[PDB]
């Protein structure tokens, strides 16, 4: 195996395929990247046994076919450290891979390509193309509501749902929920799958925000996304996601509307004097007014009064202020609508301008 | 105690006095038309003053520093902040935002003992910043030799000089200040050096320095920083500088830095060192690790002297090269077991001394 590539043609690919890797690989080969030269192309693959990221880099300089694996961090740092425009010459020599550029020489220890863990083959059952921006919107709208290391393995990930001309994402940690739906313009069969947390983040970070379309393929137990010369593949979380439809408040007849930033800044100030562990704030709603209060065990007190639009009955309700701030930070819009029922029921929060995303936050004692 | 003040006028002062249970509080004092804010950690203190034009009433209290700063910071740009003391609570109001903070009495707030100035001089902010930036990375952190966890400030002739060392590497920098000065040396604790550094903002502003037997004070604008000093036997940099180097290496800072950084990738991850081989017009830098991986860099350099091999801790060399931020570097060597001197070729304001590493 031999290739010579310009530094900047290798740097972004190396950074991308190293995504799935950790600082402390469990076994050595999992800290390596698979390098394959075949039919004028260098392929680079990184994996954590659950997902893989693959990059294809075209070879315009002389090359010889073959494959090996080498340490990802060392190989990336070498390439990054070389001067702008450096020509990077690589040659496999059994148990070592040699890297040369100018008068800089490096010998890296290899492990066989034949030992590199391969994701099993599988069959696609649904396929569609969509703008990068749409997948970006779907994930960013909901990512923050995924659980982190919950004993309920099914929540440590994101539901992707195809249904007719709609792609939908759902995320929840049992305390708060986020759902986002976007049109696609192909009619799709009904499928519902759970993408693991780590894979959601990798998918999000592979979107460059240019005009390249994203092509998605989904099987019973795998998902694949192709963007430019990058291919992301992940195993799915083998679980049944609880139904989002049943957690949305049934008849939330008390509607409040107010400016997003005015609400965000008031909650952020009140939060300063909320319980350090539990982060509780109290909302008192009355005619065209929202009063937010916080107090801590030290008997310090914050109060914010805001002009809003509200004509419903007076009520008082408590929330974890971090859950509320997470929603407001994800909306990034002019005005917010909050939909309430009573002091012991969830609130539904949406951008005033659109029902495409919705958030459900349970109240706090 | 009562005052009303623009948020605008409090922000920078609050930032500075938070620099250093009652040590988690800020002391607030209204007197003679001024609000003074003080933060301390018992070893040092920072004082900021702000003028009060709106109706105010004298008095003092202490309040949680981070909460008060965060409240002020979180209010909208242009906000007016009205404060009113009421027993064990301090009331803060701006628009229809209202806060009640728990207080501890001003009388409980620690004061540094009174002390007397023995040496005094004024110099530009910029000169003090340069002196600290040039040397601070060579301070020890948590050495049992406490007097190395800090920085020497020395007056000699018309110069102010800083010296820092951790026993393995040393940094020294001197600047003229245009006054004849007495010969004098004190050690400032590392946390004080850092806080002093952070109080200086790149403006053209005179800085007034007062040194006592046990304290140092610096006044800039309406900020006053005071620290205790460290009492110990600081090494003489004159005895650390190589007496007679007979080997001279010159190269571009960037080329040297980038070669060192690359070679270090395949050094031992726990103690990263590289080997230098110097010969006629050439530098070779090599590294290896327990996996038997190897790096080699060859550089065209200016070199005079006998051929020799010598090792270095990468981080010590990179720290120096990062503090030079200039075109050409000189390394002055003696033999494989002796320290080297590193300097900018075009400036004699600063010098660095680094022990070799055995590989
Ligand atoms: Ca104003």
UniProtKB/Swiss-Prot annotation, chain B:
Induction comment: Part of the dnaA-dnaN-recF-gyrB operon, but also transcribed from at least 3 promoters within the upstream dnaA gene, induced at 42 degrees Celsius. Induced 1.5-fold by hydroxyurea. A shorter isoform, beta* is induced by UV treatment and also at low levels in late logarithmic/early stationary phase growth (at protein level). Beta* transcription induced by naldixic acid.
Mutagenesis or variant effect for residue 126 to T: Reduction of synthesis of beta*, probably due to mutation of its promoter
UniProt xrefs under SMART domains: POL3Bc (SM00480)
Key words of the record: Cytoplasm, DNA replication, DNA-binding, DNA-directed DNA polymerase, Nucleotidyltransferase, Transferase
CDD domains xrefs: beta_clamp
Residue span of region 3: 238-358
GO biological process: bacterial-type DNA replication; DNA damage response; DNA strand elongation involved in DNA replication; DNA-templated DNA replication; error-prone translesion synthesis; negative regulation of DNA-templated DNA replication initiation; regulation of DNA-templated DNA replication initiation
Residue segments, region 2: 122-236
Compartment(s) of residence: Cytoplasm
Residue numbers spanned by region 1: 1-113
Keyword Chaperone (UniProt): no
Effect caused by changing residue 139 to L: No effect on synthesis of beta*
Signal peptide: none
Described function: Confers DNA tethering and processivity to DNA polymerases and other proteins. Acts as a clamp, forming a ring around DNA (a reaction catalyzed by the clamp-loading complex) which diffuses in an ATP-independent manner freely and bidirectionally along dsDNA. DNA bound in the ring is bent 22 degrees, in solution primed DNA is bound more tightly than dsDNA, suggesting the clamp binds both ss- and dsDNA. In a complex of DNA with this protein, alpha, epsilon and tau subunits however the DNA is only slightly bent.
Note: The temperature- and UV-sensitive allele dnaN159 does not grow at temperatures higher than 37 degrees Celsius. The global SOS response is chronically induced. The UV-sensitivity of dnaN159 is dependent upon Pol IV (dinB), it has an enhanced Pol V-dependent mutation rate (umuC, umuD), and is absolutely dependent on the polymerase activity of Pol I (polA) for viability.
Protein family: Belongs to the beta sliding clamp family.
Protein name: Beta sliding clamp
